[PDB]
Design an enzyme around this catalytic site. Structure first.
Site, PDB file in Angstrom:
ATOM      1  N   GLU A 192       6.681  21.773  78.820  1.00  0.00           N
ATOM      2  CA  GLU A 192       6.354  20.939  80.097  1.00  0.00           C
ATOM      3  C   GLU A 192       6.997  21.481  81.224  1.00  0.00           C
ATOM      4  OE1 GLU A 192       6.756  17.667  76.546  1.00  0.00           O
ATOM      5  OE2 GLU A 192       7.219  19.867  77.041  1.00  0.00           O
TER       6      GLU A 192
HETATM    7  C1  HEM Z   1      15.778  18.863  78.882  1.00  0.00           C
HETATM    8  C2  HEM Z   1      14.840  17.749  79.561  1.00  0.00           C
HETATM    9  C3  HEM Z   1      14.620  16.415  79.102  1.00  0.00           C
HETATM   10  C4  HEM Z   1      14.972  15.657  78.012  1.00  0.00           C
HETATM   11  C5  HEM Z   1      16.261  15.821  77.452  1.00  0.00           C
HETATM   12  C6  HEM Z   1      14.354  14.711  77.594  1.00  0.00           C
HETATM   13  C7  HEM Z   1      14.257  13.585  76.857  1.00  0.00           C
HETATM   14  C8  HEM Z   1      13.505  13.056  75.945  1.00  0.00           C
HETATM   15  C9  HEM Z   1      13.881  12.374  74.742  1.00  0.00           C
HETATM   16  C10 HEM Z   1      15.349  11.673  74.440  1.00  0.00           C
HETATM   17  C11 HEM Z   1      12.412  12.168  73.961  1.00  0.00           C
HETATM   18  C12 HEM Z   1      12.308  11.360  72.599  1.00  0.00           C
HETATM   19  C13 HEM Z   1      12.331   9.913  72.853  1.00  0.00           C
HETATM   20  C14 HEM Z   1      13.141   9.345  71.647  1.00  0.00           C
HETATM   21  O1  HEM Z   1      13.430   9.965  70.617  1.00  0.00           O
HETATM   22  O2  HEM Z   1      13.455   8.043  71.660  1.00  0.00           O
HETATM   23  C15 HEM Z   1      11.588  12.728  74.963  1.00  0.00           C
HETATM   24  C16 HEM Z   1      10.182  13.000  74.608  1.00  0.00           C
HETATM   25  C17 HEM Z   1       9.250  13.021  75.181  1.00  0.00           C
HETATM   26  N1  HEM Z   1       9.531  13.505  76.618  1.00  0.00           N
HETATM   27 FE1  HEM Z   1      11.190  14.361  77.439  1.00  0.00          FE
HETATM   28  N2  HEM Z   1      13.123  14.827  78.420  1.00  0.00           N
HETATM   29  C18 HEM Z   1      13.149  16.209  79.105  1.00  0.00           C
HETATM   30  C19 HEM Z   1      12.099  16.362  79.749  1.00  0.00           C
HETATM   31  C20 HEM Z   1      10.927  16.016  79.846  1.00  0.00           C
HETATM   32  C21 HEM Z   1       9.841  16.142  81.040  1.00  0.00           C
HETATM   33  C22 HEM Z   1      10.030  17.009  82.229  1.00  0.00           C
HETATM   34  C23 HEM Z   1       8.728  15.424  80.534  1.00  0.00           C
HETATM   35  C24 HEM Z   1       7.241  15.299  81.107  1.00  0.00           C
HETATM   36  C25 HEM Z   1       6.905  15.786  82.339  1.00  0.00           C
HETATM   37  C26 HEM Z   1       8.882  14.938  79.281  1.00  0.00           C
HETATM   38  C27 HEM Z   1       8.100  13.967  78.535  1.00  0.00           C
HETATM   39  C28 HEM Z   1       8.190  13.508  77.230  1.00  0.00           C
HETATM   40  C29 HEM Z   1       7.170  13.419  76.411  1.00  0.00           C
HETATM   41  C30 HEM Z   1       5.871  13.427  76.841  1.00  0.00           C
HETATM   42  C31 HEM Z   1       7.816  13.203  75.005  1.00  0.00           C
HETATM   43  C32 HEM Z   1       7.229  12.662  73.580  1.00  0.00           C
HETATM   44  C33 HEM Z   1       6.935  13.803  72.882  1.00  0.00           C
HETATM   45  C34 HEM Z   1       5.807  13.616  71.875  1.00  0.00           C
HETATM   46  O3  HEM Z   1       4.622  14.119  72.305  1.00  0.00           O
HETATM   47  O4  HEM Z   1       6.013  12.965  70.719  1.00  0.00           O
HETATM   48  N3  HEM Z   1      10.287  15.016  79.057  1.00  0.00           N
HETATM   49  N4  HEM Z   1      12.071  13.335  75.690  1.00  0.00           N
END
Ligand code: HEM
Ligand code: HEM
Ligand code: HEM
Ligand code: HEM
Ligand SMILES: [Ca+2]
Ligand SMILES: [Ca+2]
Lengths: 315, 313
Positions: free
Chosen positions: B115
């Site tokens: 992303e």
């Molecule tokens: C290094 C930077 C980032 C970290 C550390 C982070 C953190 C996380 C975490 C902890 C989860 C999983 C939630 C869980 O396991 O309870 C996750 C999933 C997700 N995050 Fe990030 N986030 C980051 C950047 C981003 C950005 C920039 C976006 C959107 C513009 C984003 C959107 C999402 C999405 C859509 C998911 C779901 C994954 C799936 O499709 O199953 N994240 N993120």
């Protein structure tokens, strides 16, 4: 001699130890807090993705680390996001424009359509949609049958910014007492900032921020950009405040010049009748580095939830 | 009658009031600070505009207020952003996939969100330009010749995310002892939540985040549950702590009402029936799942330098 110190004490002025009173906008606990939330709420934008801080990033010297800012739709804008650190003290609200337009002004409320893509009324709708924000406006703006207005919203925002100040930069501690707050090279740079005419336009409380002048930077047709004269087109550019300039790269209205030394080099312009050697444009730039104060300690606000009556994101 | 409490107290767990220690990734003052700046640093994106805070916003329940995410280039995503708050507890890691797909993963990736449009190389290179950051990696992973690795950085970001918890939520307080911590409608909601079998997938320390099930909220109330065992596809039963403040709901974020989504989930498929008042009372309960939102100092992030690459819009 050390006449230089006493000299500087008369042209410049340190950043007050505490946020300045705004006229007709009495700062108070809630007001700052409400302004804080507001500065950091992407719902002030249409997408619900952009806040002020997206472009005036308190954690990043106040700007956006972009040549020019890119707002709604991923649209690249025409101008550098100037810092928001110490903006409270500038009177020149724009980068540039027609002299007959700039002539008068000011001082207005912050308006960001284009960048945020929201009409003032939509902004007021959103606010009114969230209960907690109403209770908050009533507390911050007490006497009003209606406090939830784009003017009070701006007042609160601006009262928060009043606190986004940067006291005790090495140079401020030099204007106060400590003469060795500045080092050799930096103190050499102070003198050149003066004796080359730099304080003419970059002077006072904010080392600029106060006036318009008919000079701007462009691409040379044939070191790579140069100050041009816009006196003929009845145009003017603001001479920006040089405070924290080290941490707000890239430079000028178009953000075409990333190096601070190199930006001094452009400013030592023939048009102002200044010639700089590399050592001087080195040394000066050094002194410019001395203008970096103590960055804002800000607790990320805990903003309230949308209600069924909040407008959905229009991306 | 008030023995319902011990039924819950043996089915759930409150949030610990201090960040949990992670497997081979110990916390420390300097590592949490470093983890923080990394987390609010937008320079992990090619564009220099997006950070893990862009989508996981501490100020808004750790999410992003969208159905699905934007996105370098203003480009929508396939999935709703899940909340950062208490993610440190969830074992189930992705929204959805085939069971086999997800199977072999535990020893694999981390990471680089596609992303943000950077490569682990490009990220590393970026932190290697900013001398202050370099020093912090060496102070954070003090043994090593070269601590500035993608994994050490994900490790840093992980340790601070571990501090993003939400204790003393009405309910958590209710479990801890205090009976009146829940008002009337909430107690009736908790009652039902159990009696209807809600706690089967949405139980535990995080009330979900711990299992996978062949069940998807899809278009069709516009919305409904579907069985996908057929296709061999599975979905996360997610932690409904803070579910009052992390709309829209579901994998695609297609339902904005915490009431509609509760109704979508008293489904034929689970062998369940809910009445308006019943679905309305379950939401009432799920409201009490909202905990102390974290107090966190916006970090001040080091200057870029000559070396630091330029934004790619
Ligand atoms: C290094 C930077 C980032 C970290 C550390 C982070 C953190 C996380 C975490 C902890 C989860 C999983 C939630 C869980 O396991 O309870 C996750 C999933 C997700 N995050 Fe990030 N986030 C980051 C950047 C981003 C950005 C920039 C976006 C959107 C513009 C984003 C959107 C999402 C999405 C859509 C998911 C779901 C994954 C799936 O499709 O199953 N994240 N993120
Ligand atoms: C609604 C919240 C916002 C506030 C309070 C705010 C604050 C400010 C302030 C105080 C100034 C004047 C600087 C000075 O006068 O010294 C300014 C100028 C500017 N700001 Fe913002 N900003 C907001 C939203 C945005 C956003 C989202 C962007 C970027 C997309 C942005 C980008 C800019 C730019 C490009 C200028 C220079 C405009 C020009 O002179 O042509 N602002 N902003
Ligand atoms: C060699 C002496 C000078 C130095 C070191 C100097 C320093 C600087 C710096 C560092 C900037 C970067 C602005 C920013 O992005 O924050 C700047 C811009 C600017 N300064 Fe100066 N300055 C000098 C001479 C002058 C003079 C004499 C004037 C007025 C007559 C002036 C008016 C301006 C204007 C109008 C801008 C904005 C220009 C643009 O965007 O094209 N400068 N200056
Ligand atoms: C009537 C009782 C139930 C209620 C009120 C309920 C509540 C919810 C809510 C509000 C969501 C949306 C979460 C979010 O997006 O943050 C959700 C998602 C989900 N829950 Fe339930 N739950 C119930 C019973 C169950 C049961 C019995 C299962 C497993 C067999 C289950 C598994 C799931 C699954 C698979 C999703 C993902 C939906 C998707 O995105 O496709 N839930 N639940
Ligand atoms: Ca700049
Ligand atoms: Ca959600």
């Amino acid at each position: 001699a050390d006449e230089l110190q006493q000299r500087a004490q008369g042209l410049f002025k340190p950043v007050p130890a505490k946020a300045p009173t705004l006229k007709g906008n009495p700062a108070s606990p809630v007001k700052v807090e409400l302004g804080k939330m507001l500065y950091f709420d992407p719902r002030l934008s249409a997408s619900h993705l952009i806040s002020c801080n997206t472009c005036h990033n308190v954690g990043l010297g106040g700007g956006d680390l972009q040549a020019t800012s890119t707002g709604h739709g991923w649209q690249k804008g025409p101008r550098n996001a100037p810092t928001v650190l110490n903006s409270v003290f500038n009177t020149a609200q724009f980068w540039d424009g027609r002299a007959k337009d700039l002539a008068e002004q000011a001082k207005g409320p912050v308006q960001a359509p284009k960048e945020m893509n929201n009409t003032p009324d939509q902004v007021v709708k959103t606010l009114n949609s969230i209960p907690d924000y109403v209770a908050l406006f009533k507390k911050a703006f007490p006497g009003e049958k209606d406090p939830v207005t784009f003017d009070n919203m701006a007042k609160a925002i601006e009262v928060f910014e009043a606190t986004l100040i940067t006291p005790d930069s090495p140079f401020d501690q030099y204007l106060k007492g400590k003469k060795k707050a500045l080092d050799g090279k930096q103190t050499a740079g102070l003198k050149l900032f003066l004796d080359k005419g730099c304080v003419a336009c970059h002077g006072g409380l904010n080392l600029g921020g106060t006036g318009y002048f008919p000079f701007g930077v462009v691409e040379k047709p044939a070191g790579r950009f140069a100050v041009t004269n816009t006196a003929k087109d009845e145009y003017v550019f603001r001479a920006p405040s040089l405070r924290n300039v080290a941490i707000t790269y890239p430079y000028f209205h178009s953000g075409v010049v990333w190096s601070l030394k190199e930006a001094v080099a452009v400013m030592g312009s023939a048009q102002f009748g200044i010639k700089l050697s590399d050592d001087e444009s080195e040394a000066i730039a050094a002194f410019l580095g001395s203008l970096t104060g103590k960055q804002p300690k800000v607790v990320y606000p805990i903003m309230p939830a949308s209600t069924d009556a909040t407008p959905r994101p229009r991306l």
